[PDB]
């Protein structure tokens, strides 16, 4: 994933737990070698998994719980590290943001085109709910999509209730969520 992602992880860990524990996690992930992540440089995904795996053990916290907190962190982080305009442009509400999300990734994709953005389809079931289809080149990131959704809820002061109803991990085509909101 682009370096922005690993910079975001390094940021929330060292914000919440301390620079000491971050370098610990970094050591454990076998990533003591590299000095600082480069935001616009593409990395191989393992660097992210190993950081999340390594953070799980150092913090004695389940990985999915870390992916959840990271998903939520990402929404605020990106607003403040050069992407608040791009965020604001994806829209005014949770349903609209999700509809624009493929378009937003298309924009980001142009900037540096080694981006492999996930696909999000919405089937609105009412004025207050939807079924979200999350299609990814990457495995494991459903818990992060949950956090992302609660991040957007915070962003729009919208209460969100999300339950995962299909599971890529099992061999199903793709993750699916049912969502209810304010």
Ligand X SMILES: O=C(O)CCCCN(CCc1ccccc1OCc1ccc(-c2ccc(Oc3ccccc3)cc2)cc1)Cc1ccc(C(=O)O)cc1
Residue 9 contacts which entry, a copy of itself, ligand X, none (Cβ below 5-8 A, type-dependent): none
Which residues bind to ligand X, rule: CB under 6 A? 1-2, 4-5, 40, 75, 78, 83, 86, 101, 108, 111-112, 115-118, 136-138, 141, 144, 148, 152
Q: HSE of 49 in the Cβ direction (CA atoms, 13 Å)? A: 7
Tally of helices (H runs) and strands (E runs) in the chain: 7, 4
**Among candidate residues 163, 167, 2, 161, the one with its CA nearest the CA of residue 74:** 2
Rounded to an integer, what distance in angstroms lies between the CA atom of residue 34 and that of residue 160? 38
Residue 62 contacts which entry, ligand X, a copy of itself, none (Cβ below 5-8 A, type-dependent): a copy of itself
Residue 103 contacts which entry, a copy of itself, ligand X, none (Cβ below 5-8 A, type-dependent): none
Rounded to an integer, what distance in angstroms lies between the CA atom of residue 2 and that of residue 43? 6
Query: If binding is defined by CB under 8 A, does position 55 make contact with a copy of itself?
Result: no
Q: Please enumerate, by residue number, every residue annotated as part of a binding site.
A: 2, 74, 105, 116, 134, 136, 138
Q: Please enumerate, by residue number, every residue annotated as part of a binding site for heme b.
A: 2, 74, 105, 116, 134, 136, 138
């Amino acid at each position: 994933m682009y370096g922005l992602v690993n910079k975001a992880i390094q940021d929330m860990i060292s914000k919440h737990h301390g620079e000491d524990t971050w370098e610990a996690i970094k050591q454990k992930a076998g990533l003591e070698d590299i000095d600082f992540f480069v935001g616009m440089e593409a990395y191989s995904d393992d660097v992210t998994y190993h950081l999340v795996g390594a953070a799980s053990e150092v913090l004695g916290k389940p990985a999915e719980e870390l992916l959840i907190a990271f998903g939520e962190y990402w929404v605020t982080y990106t607003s403040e590290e050069g992407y608040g305009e791009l965020l604001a442009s994806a829209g005014d509400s949770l349903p609209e943001f999700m509809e624009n999300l493929d378009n937003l990734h298309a924009r980001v994709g142009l900037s540096f085109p080694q981006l492999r953005p996930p696909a999000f389809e919405c089937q609105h079931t009412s004025s207050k709910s939807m079924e979200l289809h999350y299609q990814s080149t990457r495995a494991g990131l459903a818990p992060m999509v949950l956090g992302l959704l609660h991040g957007l809820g915070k962003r729009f002061q919208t209460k969100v209730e999300v339950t995962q109803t299909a599971f890529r991990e099992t061999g199903e085509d793709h993750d699916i969520f049912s969502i209810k909101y304010e």
